[PDB]
Design an enzyme around this catalytic site. Structure first.
Site, PDB file in Angstrom:
ATOM      1  CD  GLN A  73      -2.747  -1.295   2.425  1.00  0.00           C
ATOM      2  OE1 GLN A  73      -3.773  -2.526   2.324  1.00  0.00           O
ATOM      3  NE2 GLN A  73      -2.711  -0.362   3.409  1.00  0.00           N
ATOM      4  CG  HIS A  96      -1.968   4.132   1.417  1.00  0.00           C
ATOM      5  ND1 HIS A  96      -2.776   3.790   2.228  1.00  0.00           N
ATOM      6  CD2 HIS A  96      -0.850   3.617   2.343  1.00  0.00           C
ATOM      7  CE1 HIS A  96      -2.471   2.906   3.369  1.00  0.00           C
ATOM      8  NE2 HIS A  96      -1.328   3.225   3.348  1.00  0.00           N
ATOM      9  CG  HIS A 107      -3.846  -7.653   8.452  1.00  0.00           C
ATOM     10  ND1 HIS A 107      -3.037  -7.000   7.353  1.00  0.00           N
ATOM     11  CD2 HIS A 107      -5.152  -6.908   8.605  1.00  0.00           C
ATOM     12  CE1 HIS A 107      -3.677  -6.162   6.887  1.00  0.00           C
ATOM     13  NE2 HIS A 107      -4.680  -5.767   7.673  1.00  0.00           N
ATOM     14  CG  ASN A 111      -5.507  -5.187   3.226  1.00  0.00           C
ATOM     15  OD1 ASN A 111      -5.069  -5.220   2.049  1.00  0.00           O
ATOM     16  ND2 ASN A 111      -4.912  -3.978   4.268  1.00  0.00           N
TER      17      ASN A 111
HETATM   18  C1  LIG Z   1      -8.369  -0.929  13.599  1.00  0.00           C
HETATM   19  C2  LIG Z   1      -8.012  -1.245  12.020  1.00  0.00           C
HETATM   20  C3  LIG Z   1      -8.405  -2.534  11.435  1.00  0.00           C
HETATM   21  C4  LIG Z   1      -8.267  -2.691   9.981  1.00  0.00           C
HETATM   22  C5  LIG Z   1      -7.723  -1.549   9.281  1.00  0.00           C
HETATM   23  C6  LIG Z   1      -6.917  -0.526   9.978  1.00  0.00           C
HETATM   24  C7  LIG Z   1      -7.237  -0.276  11.402  1.00  0.00           C
HETATM   25  C8  LIG Z   1      -6.273   0.604  12.059  1.00  0.00           C
HETATM   26  N1  LIG Z   1      -7.385  -1.548   8.112  1.00  0.00           N
HETATM   27  C9  LIG Z   1      -7.951  -2.860   7.367  1.00  0.00           C
HETATM   28  C10 LIG Z   1      -8.509  -3.776   8.033  1.00  0.00           C
HETATM   29  N2  LIG Z   1      -8.672  -5.012   7.404  1.00  0.00           N
HETATM   30  C11 LIG Z   1      -8.837  -5.088   5.983  1.00  0.00           C
HETATM   31  O1  LIG Z   1      -9.121  -6.009   5.511  1.00  0.00           O
HETATM   32  N3  LIG Z   1      -8.455  -3.671   5.432  1.00  0.00           N
HETATM   33  C12 LIG Z   1      -8.197  -2.633   5.831  1.00  0.00           C
HETATM   34  O2  LIG Z   1      -7.569  -1.676   5.301  1.00  0.00           O
HETATM   35  N4  LIG Z   1      -8.427  -3.898   9.201  1.00  0.00           N
HETATM   36  C13 LIG Z   1      -9.026  -5.073   9.968  1.00  0.00           C
HETATM   37  C14 LIG Z   1     -10.725  -5.300   9.886  1.00  0.00           C
HETATM   38  O3  LIG Z   1     -11.229  -4.236  10.525  1.00  0.00           O
HETATM   39  C15 LIG Z   1     -10.976  -6.607  10.862  1.00  0.00           C
HETATM   40  O4  LIG Z   1     -10.223  -7.843  10.030  1.00  0.00           O
HETATM   41  C16 LIG Z   1     -12.382  -6.792  10.577  1.00  0.00           C
HETATM   42  O5  LIG Z   1     -13.204  -5.901  11.285  1.00  0.00           O
HETATM   43  C17 LIG Z   1     -12.754  -8.184  11.359  1.00  0.00           C
HETATM   44  O6  LIG Z   1     -14.129  -8.294  11.427  1.00  0.00           O
HETATM   45  P1  LIG Z   1     -14.799  -9.166  12.444  1.00  0.00           P
HETATM   46  O7  LIG Z   1     -14.347 -10.503  12.423  1.00  0.00           O
HETATM   47  O8  LIG Z   1     -16.268  -8.905  12.431  1.00  0.00           O
HETATM   48  O9  LIG Z   1     -14.175  -8.733  13.779  1.00  0.00           O
HETATM   49  P2  LIG Z   1     -14.219  -7.065  14.505  1.00  0.00           P
HETATM   50  O10 LIG Z   1     -13.058  -7.256  15.647  1.00  0.00           O
HETATM   51  O11 LIG Z   1     -14.406  -5.946  13.409  1.00  0.00           O
HETATM   52  O12 LIG Z   1     -15.686  -7.163  15.513  1.00  0.00           O
HETATM   53  C18 LIG Z   1     -15.784  -8.168  16.469  1.00  0.00           C
HETATM   54  C19 LIG Z   1     -16.579  -7.629  17.541  1.00  0.00           C
HETATM   55  O13 LIG Z   1     -17.185  -8.583  18.561  1.00  0.00           O
HETATM   56  C20 LIG Z   1     -17.162  -7.918  19.789  1.00  0.00           C
HETATM   57  N5  LIG Z   1     -16.569  -8.978  20.844  1.00  0.00           N
HETATM   58  C21 LIG Z   1     -15.721  -9.213  21.117  1.00  0.00           C
HETATM   59  N6  LIG Z   1     -15.799 -10.177  22.186  1.00  0.00           N
HETATM   60  C22 LIG Z   1     -16.910 -10.478  22.495  1.00  0.00           C
HETATM   61  C23 LIG Z   1     -17.664 -11.073  23.411  1.00  0.00           C
HETATM   62  N7  LIG Z   1     -17.258 -12.042  24.021  1.00  0.00           N
HETATM   63  N8  LIG Z   1     -19.027 -11.129  23.516  1.00  0.00           N
HETATM   64  C24 LIG Z   1     -19.697 -10.296  22.583  1.00  0.00           C
HETATM   65  N9  LIG Z   1     -19.164  -9.504  21.495  1.00  0.00           N
HETATM   66  C25 LIG Z   1     -17.669  -9.561  21.565  1.00  0.00           C
HETATM   67  C26 LIG Z   1     -16.775  -6.653  19.710  1.00  0.00           C
HETATM   68  O14 LIG Z   1     -17.421  -5.396  20.577  1.00  0.00           O
HETATM   69  C27 LIG Z   1     -16.636  -6.198  18.066  1.00  0.00           C
HETATM   70  O15 LIG Z   1     -17.417  -5.069  17.667  1.00  0.00           O
HETATM   71  O1  LIG Z   2      -1.161   0.074  10.387  1.00  0.00           O
HETATM   72  C1  LIG Z   2      -1.728  -1.371  10.043  1.00  0.00           C
HETATM   73  C2  LIG Z   2      -2.956  -1.094   8.917  1.00  0.00           C
HETATM   74  O2  LIG Z   2      -2.504  -0.189   8.140  1.00  0.00           O
HETATM   75  C3  LIG Z   2      -3.257  -0.151   6.802  1.00  0.00           C
HETATM   76  O3  LIG Z   2      -2.377   0.606   5.977  1.00  0.00           O
HETATM   77  C4  LIG Z   2      -4.043  -1.368   6.271  1.00  0.00           C
HETATM   78  F1  LIG Z   2      -5.043  -0.814   5.384  1.00  0.00           F
HETATM   79  C5  LIG Z   2      -4.166  -2.281   7.359  1.00  0.00           C
HETATM   80  O4  LIG Z   2      -4.837  -3.579   6.661  1.00  0.00           O
HETATM   81  C6  LIG Z   2      -3.729  -2.432   8.838  1.00  0.00           C
HETATM   82  O5  LIG Z   2      -4.396  -2.854   9.634  1.00  0.00           O
END
Ligand SMILES: *Cc1cc2c(cc1C)Nc1c([nH]c(=O)[nH]c1=O)N2C[C@H](O)[C@H](O)[C@H](O)COP(=O)(O)OP(=O)(O)OC[C@H]1O[C@@H](n2cnc3c(N)ncnc32)[C@H](O)[C@@H]1O
Ligand SMILES: OC[C@H]1O[C@@H](O)[C@H](F)[C@@H](O)[C@@H]1O
Ligand SMILES: *Cc1cc2c(cc1C)Nc1c([nH]c(=O)[nH]c1=O)N2C[C@H](O)[C@H](O)[C@H](O)COP(=O)(O)OP(=O)(O)OC[C@H]1O[C@@H](n2cnc3c(N)ncnc32)[C@H](O)[C@@H]1O
Ligand SMILES: *Cc1cc2c(cc1C)Nc1c([nH]c(=O)[nH]c1=O)N2C[C@H](O)[C@H](O)[C@H](O)COP(=O)(O)OP(=O)(O)OC[C@H]1O[C@@H](n2cnc3c(N)ncnc32)[C@H](O)[C@@H]1O
Ligand SMILES: OC[C@H]1O[C@@H](O)[C@H](F)[C@@H](O)[C@@H]1O
Lengths: 576, 576, 90, 90
Positions: B406, B408, B506, B551
C-alpha cells in the site's frame, strides 16, 4: 426544515442545550443547528466516556479528546529539516502550508486553542468540573447591592447545578481521594479549605460514573414525541450557520443563513428569537461575518461602529500542570492501623486490625478494604485496592490564592517510562490562573483567509498581560510546587510546566457582558442580549467579562438561564 | 430479549454483519450481541471517518483509531525510573502492575495486538483496503480442481465486493495518485503491475469519500421495521457473550451465556444456530471459556481432546513502514507541459499550456488544474492543487514479490518537524509479509488471570518463524526501500522500520479452517462449521489457515458467505 | 582553560561526559520488538554490554562515575569550593 | 550545558542554572561492596552499590530542597522548558 420557528439556537453544546431546555419546556417552537454531527450513540449529545469500555480503559479516552480538538490558528511552520535525500523536492522558503494561518504571529497566539464540532459540543469530552465563581471572579448581575447580587447568582447556580447534576459526593469512599484530601486539609489547616471538585456526574456503581453532558441538560430528541407530546423541538446537525441578517437600524435580526453540509444547499431560517451558542470563538466569527465589529487586522484608529468591543478584552487562563508519585509517608499511613507480621507470600504472613478501636486513624470500612487487599494480593506491595476511584480534590479560588485547583486524575497518555509507575501512586495537578481583560488582547478574523468551512479565519493577538496576571501565574506555579510536595515528588516526564496558551480551553470575554456598552466596553447586557437588538442573544464563555480561574461552564449556563428568563418575559410562544 | 431465536450471532463487526445480511434477508429470526456499544451516530456501525469534520481534518482520525484499540496482552514493565524524589513511595521489585499480564513473555508477544469493542467492530475505523487473495495465499474451497476452486472464490469475492462496495476507481482523477502510479508502472514495466488499492468506499464529491463499514453490509436496524416489515433482527449492545453450552457428545450447542453489562444480569439465550464472530482473539477466548481446547499454559504433551488445533498455528503479518517526500523529478514532471515565464508574484509571471497538443505528457484535465493552481496561488511553490486526493496505489502480492503493498496516505500524527514538510509531498508505504502457520505459535488463555471483562486472559507465544517467513520479511523491507526510492527520499521521523508485531491487526489462524480436522490441523471445515457440531459456526480472520500478506477481511467475508449458504441449506427459518 | 573552550563553553559538556565512566550499570531489561525477524535475538535479558550482574537496579547510584586521567576529576570540575559549617563537618 | 534545539531558541543571557544539593545521613545499610566473581575493565573487583536515600530526615529535606528551589527560582524567572525541576539520577 420549516422556514419559520419561534426560537433558533446556533450550537448544541451545553449552553445551547440550556436555552433548549428552558425554552422548549416553556412551549416555544425551537430549532437547533449544529455544524457537527450526531456522534455519541443513541443518547444524542451524551458524554463519550460513559461507555463500559472507556470506564474500563480510561486513559484511552485522551485520544477521544485529541481526536475532536481542531486547532483554531496555526502559525506558519519554520522548522528546518535538512536530512532529506538530495532527490526530494524542497521549497526555498517556509511558505504557507499544511493549513497554517499566514495572518498569525506565532509569538502572539493562543496556540493551544481548539474547537469541537459535534452534537453536544465539548460537553461530549469535557472533565465535568463545575465550580461556582466567588465575587472576585464573577460579573455583577445586580449593581450596588452585593447581597442581592449573591442571591441572584445563588439561585442561578443552584438551577445550573440541577441541570448538570453537579455533586461533591461521588468520590467520598475512595482511599486515594481521602488520602490526598486529608493530608492537604491538615497541612493548610486554618489557611485553606479543601473539598471534592464539584463534578457534573452521577455514580452508578463503584466502578461506573455517568458523566454529565449536553444530553443531561436536554436530551436533544425531536419533539413532539411520546414523552413530550406538547413540545416542539428540531435538531438539524451538519448545518453550518453562516450569518445573521441585521435590519437597517441594528435593532432586530431578520433571519439566519444556513448551509446544509450534506446536500450543499443554502437556506434562510426565520425566527422571533436568535440565540448564538457556537462557542467563544465561533460566536464571534458568526457575528463578524454578519457585519458586527470589523473584518481584518484591527487597525488602531478606525474602530468598528457596531459593537466596537467585540473580540477585544479576550481572556484565557494560565494553566500549570504536573503529576506526583505518592509519598512513602502517605502510603504507609494507609496501613497505619494494621499489625503486619511476616513477609508477604510466606506462610506466616498476616495483616490484621481491631475494628472500632478508638486509637485507629481510619474507619472500619477503610481498614477492611486495606486488610482484604493486602491479604488477598500478597504479590502487590501497595495497600490500595485496585479499583479504588481516583482523587478529586480542590481548594477553590480565594483572594490569598487566586487560582483554581484540581488535584485529581484525568485521562492521560502515559509514556512507556511513566507506565513503570503504578497508577495508584499518581496524582494530576492542574492550577488555573485568572487573566485580566485587556483591550489589546484580541480575536480577529481575516478579510482574505478562510477556514475549513470557508468562514473568516480566526487570528489571535494575545499575550498574558503584564503586572498582576503574570505575577499571579508565577505565584500559582510556585503554589503548585509547594502544595504538590506535601503529597509526593514529581513524576518524571510530567514535571511542573506551563501548558501552551489556550490549551485549557477556557477562553472568555470575546463577546463580553456588562451593564453599559460604552462604559463597560461590552457587547451584551446581563440578559445576554446584544446591545441594540430586540431578539439576538449570545450564550457561553465569551460573555464572561471578568478575570476568572475556575472552570467557566457553570457560570455560562447560569447566565444562559437568566437570558432565557428574559426571553420568557418578552416573547410569546406561537400557538401549537 | 426473547429467550429463543433462529440464529444468534456474537459480534457486530463486518463478518457478524455478513451473517446478519445473508440470514436476516433469508427470513431467519436473528439476534446479535456485541459487548461494545452503539458509538458511530444514527447509522449504526458506520465508519467514524464519514463525518464532514473528519473529512476536513483527516489526520485527527488517528486519535479515533488509537482511542478504540485496547492492547491484548501487555507484559510486566521493568523500566527503571531513578529520578524520583527520595520521598516518593517505590516498590523493591517490578511487580505486576497497571494491567500488565504476568503470564506474557515480553519476547514472545504480539505487543501490537489490540481489540475494539464497539458496535461495528474494527470496521468503524478500518482503512477499507479489500484486495483478493491469489491462490498462493488462499485456502482451498475445492479439493483437486484449481479452476473449480478459482471459480468458487470468484463468485464469493464478487458478492463480498458487492456488500462492501469495493471499487478501484475512486481516486482516478488525483494528480498525486496518478503521479505515483505512473512512475511505478513505468519503472517496473514488464515485471510488476500496479493498480489502485481496491477500497470499500463510495466517492460522494471531490472532497468526500464515504468509507464502507459493517453498516454498509447490514444497517443493523431492528426488524421488522417499515423498510423490512417481514425481517426479524434484534441488536443487543453492551452484552458480553461468555460461553456456548455444549451438549455431552460435542455435537450441538444448546445455548449461549450472556451478561448484560448495563443491568448486570446473566441470561441464557437459545437458538437453532450459533455464529461466533467476535474477532480472531475473542472467538478463541469464548471457545476456550466453553471447554474447547485447554485453559492454561499449553503443556507439551497433554493436548486438548476437543479441537486440539484451536489457538495453534496463529499467523500475524510482518509490517514495514516508511514515508517519502516526493522527488524533484516527479514534482517537475507535474508541470512538464507548461511554459513558465517570469518569477511568481511578479507582474510578468505566467503559466500556459496548449490544450490537445500531441507532445503533452498529460491530458487537458491535468494541465488545467495545474495551470489554474499555479496562476491563482503564486505564493505556493508546488503545482499540485490543495484538495488533490491522496495516492492509493498497490502492486498486489505475487510469487516473485510475496507481500502486499500500500503506497498511499492514511491518517497520521505528524511530529512538529515532519509538519514542516508540505503534505502534498508525503507518501505512506506499508508492506505486509505472509507468515507461515506453525504449531508452536499460539494464543492461549490463563487459568488464573482474567481480563477487564473477567474472561480468561489472552497470552501469546509467538515468534515470526525461521526460514521463509523471516527471510521474506527482510526481502520485503528491502523491496520497500528500493521501490520507495523511485518516488522520493524517506521522510525523517518516518524512516524504514518494522512495526511492532501485531500492530497490523491481521491475526489469522486462531480457529483455522481445513478439510480434515486431524490431517489439516484445523478447527472448522470449509462451511466454517466447527468439527463435530451441527449448529456452531465461526466467522472471521481466525478461520484463515494460510500464509497471507493481503488485507484479510474480504477473504473472511467470502468464507462467511459460504458458511451462510450452508446454514440456508440445513436450517429452516421459523414461521414469522 | 583553552582559548577555544573559553570561546565555546557549552562544548565542554562533552569533555566532562567523555571522561565519566559509570561505576555500576545494571542488566538492561528494555524490550526492543521492532527488530527485523531475521535479526538474531536472545530469549532472555542476559548479562550484556558491560552491565554488572551483581547490581540491583533499584538500589544503585546509577549516576556514579569515575575519571581516570592525570589530574583526576579536577581536569573537568566546576571549581566550587565552599567551606562546611559545623553542622556538615567532622 | 548541551542545550536542545528548542532551548537554543532562548537567548543565552536569559538562562540561569539552579542546582541544589541535599545532605545524606550516614547509614550502615548504605554500602559500596565488591564482587568476588565479577571484575571491572582493569580486572579489579567490580564495585556494586546497595543504596537508598535514607528515610526520615534525608528524604524529607530532599523534598523541602526541591520546594526551596522552585520557590527561589520563581523570584528570578520561569522554568526553561526541557530543563524543568527534577531530581538527577542518584
Ligand atoms: C483498527 C484497524 C483495522 C483494520 C484496518 C485498519 C485499522 C487501524 N485496515 C484494514 C483492516 N482490514 C482490512 O481487510 N483492510 C483494511 O484496510 N483492518 C481489520 C478489519 O477491521 C478486521 O479484520 C475486521 O473488522 C474483522 O471483522 P470481524 O471478524 O467482524 O471482527 P471485529 O473485530 O471487527 O468485530 C468483532 C466484534 O465482536 C465483539 N466482541 C468481542 N468479544 C465479544 C464477546 N465475548 N461477546 C460479545 N461481543 C464480543 C466486539 O465488541 C466487536 O465489535
Ligand atoms: O497499520 C496497520 C494497518 O494499516 C493499513 O495501511 C492497512 F490498510 C491495514 O490493513 C492495517 O490494519
Ligand atoms: C475539550 C474540553 C473542554 C472542557 C473540559 C476538558 C476538555 C478536554 N473540561 C471542562 C470544561 N469546562 C468546564 O467548565 N469544566 C470542565 O471540567 N471544558 C470546556 C467546556 O466544555 C466548554 O466551556 C463548554 O462546552 C462550552 O459550551 P458551549 O458554549 O455550548 O460551546 P461548545 O463548544 O461545547 O459547543 C458549541 C457548538 O456549536 C457548534 N458550532 C460552532 N460553530 C458553528 C457554526 N458556525 N454553525 C453551527 N454550529 C456551530 C459546534 O459544532 C459545537 O457543538
Ligand atoms: C566530574 C566533576 C567533578 C566535580 C565537579 C563537576 C564535575 C562534572 N564539580 C565540583 C566537584 N567538587 C568540588 O568540590 N566542587 C566542584 O564544583 N567535583 C568533584 C571533585 O572533582 C572530586 O571531589 C575531586 O577531584 C576528588 O579528588 P581526588 O580524591 O583526588 O579524586 P579524583 O577522582 O579527582 O582522582 C583520583 C585519581 O586516582 C586514579 N585512580 C583511580 N584508581 C586507581 C588505581 N587503582 N590505581 C592508580 N590510580 C588510580 C585516577 O586515574 C584519578 O586520576
Ligand atoms: O487540560 C485542560 C482542561 O483540564 C481539566 O483538568 C479541567 F477540568 C478543564 O476545565 C480544562 O479544559
Amino acid at each position: 426544515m420549516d422556514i419559520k420557528y419561534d426560537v433558533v439556537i446556533v450550537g448544541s453544546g451545553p449552553i445551547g442545550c440550556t436555552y433548549a431546555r428552558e425554552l422548549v419546556g416553556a412551549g416555544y417552537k425551537v430549532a437547533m443547528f449544529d455544524i457537527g454531527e450526531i456522534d455519541s450513540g443513541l443518547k444524542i449529545g451524551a458524554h463519550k466516556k460513559n461507555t463500559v469500555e472507556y470506564q474500563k480503559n480510561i486513559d484511552k479516552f485522551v485520544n477521544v479528546i485529541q481526536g475532536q480538538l481542531m486547532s483554531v490558528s496555526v502559525p506558519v511552520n519554520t522548522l528546518v529539516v535538512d536530512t532529506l535525500s538530495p532527490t526530494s523536492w524542497q521549497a526555498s522558503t517556509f511558505f504557507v502550508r499544511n493549513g497554517s494561518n499566514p495572518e498569525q504571529d506565532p509569538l502572539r497566539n493562543l496556540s493551544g486553542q481548539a474547537v469541537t464540532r459535534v452534537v453536544g459540543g465539548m460537553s461530549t469530552h469535557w472533565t465535568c468540573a463545575t465550580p461556582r465563581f466567588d465575587r472576585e471572579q464573577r460579573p455583577l448581575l445586580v449593581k450596588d447591592d452585593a447581597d442581592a447580587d449573591d442571591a441572584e447568582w445563588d439561585r442561578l447556580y443552584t438551577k445550573a447545578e440541577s441541570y448538570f447534576q453537579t455533586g461533591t459526593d461521588q468520590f467520598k469512599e475512595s482511599i486515594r481521594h481521602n488520602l490526598v484530601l486529608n493530608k492537604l486539609t491538615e497541612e493548610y489547616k486554618g489557611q485553606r479549605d479543601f473539598q471534592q471538585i464539584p463534578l457534573a456526574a452521577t455514580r452508578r456503581s463503584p466502578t461506573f460514573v455517568e458523566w454529565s453532558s449536553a444530553n443531561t441538560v436536554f436530551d436533544l430528541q425531536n419533539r413532539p414525541n411520546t414523552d413530550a407530546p406538547e413540545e416542539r423541538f428540531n435538531l438539524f446537525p451538519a448545518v453550518a450557520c453562516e450569518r445573521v441578517v441585521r435590519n437597517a437600524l441594528n435593532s432586530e435580526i431578520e433571519s439566519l443563513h444556513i448551509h446544509d453540509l450534506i446536500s450543499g444547499d443554502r437556506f434562510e431560517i426565520k425566527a422571533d428569537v436568535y440565540v448564538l451558542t457556537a462557542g467563544a470563538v465561533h460566536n464571534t466569527q458568526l457575528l463578524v461575518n454578519s457585519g458586527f465589529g470589523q473584518l481584518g487586522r484591527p487597525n488602531p484608529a478606525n474602530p468598528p461602529e457596531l459593537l466596537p468591543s467585540l473580540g477585544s478584552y479576550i481572556t484565557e487562563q494560565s494553566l500549570v500542570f504536573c503529576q506526583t508519585v505518592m509519598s512513602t509517608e502517605l502510603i504507609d499511613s494507609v496501613k497505619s492501623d494494621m499489625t503486619i507480621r511476616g513477609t508477604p507470600g510466606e506462610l506466616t504472613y498476616s495483616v490484621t486490625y481491631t475494628p472500632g478501636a478508638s486509637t485507629n486513624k481510619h474507619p472500619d470500612w477503610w481498614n477492611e478494604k486495606v486488610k482484604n487487599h493486602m491479604m488477598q494480593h500478597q504479590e502487590d506491595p501497595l495497600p490500595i485496592p485496585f479499583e479504588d476511584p481516583e482523587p478529586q480534590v480542590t481548594t477553590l479560588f480565594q483572594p490569598s490564592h487566586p487560582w483554581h485547583t484540581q488535584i485529581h486524575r484525568d485521562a492521560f497518555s502515559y509514556g512507556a517510562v511513566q507506565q513503570s509507575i503504578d497508577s495508584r501512586l499518581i496524582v494530576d495537578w492542574r492550577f488555573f490562573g485568572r487573566t485580566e481583560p485587556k483591550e489589546e488582547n484580541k480575536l480577529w478574523f481575516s478579510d482574505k483567509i478562510t477556514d475549513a468551512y470557508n468562514m473568516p479565519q480566526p487570528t489571535f493577538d494575545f499575550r498574558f498581560p503584564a503586572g498582576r496576571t503574570s505575577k499571579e501565574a508565577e505565584d500559582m506555579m510556585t503554589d503548585m510546587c509547594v502544595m504538590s510536595a506535601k503529597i509526593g515528588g514529581f513524576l518524571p516526564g510530567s514535571l511542573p510546566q506551563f501548558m501552551e496558551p489556550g490549551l485549557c480551553l477556557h477562553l472568555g470575554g470575546t463577546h463580553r457582558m456588562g451593564f453599559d456598552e460604552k462604559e463597560d466596553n461590552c457587547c451584551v447586557n446581563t440578559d445576554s442580549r446584544v446591545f441594540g437588538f430586540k431578539n439576538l442573544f449570545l450564550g457561553g464563555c465569551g460573555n464572561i467579562p471578568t478575570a476568572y480561574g475556575a472552570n467557566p461552564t457553570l457560570t455560562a449556563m447560569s447566565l444562559a438561564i437568566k437570558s432565557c428568563e428574559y426571553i420568557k418575559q418578552n416573547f410569546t410562544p406561537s400557538p401549537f
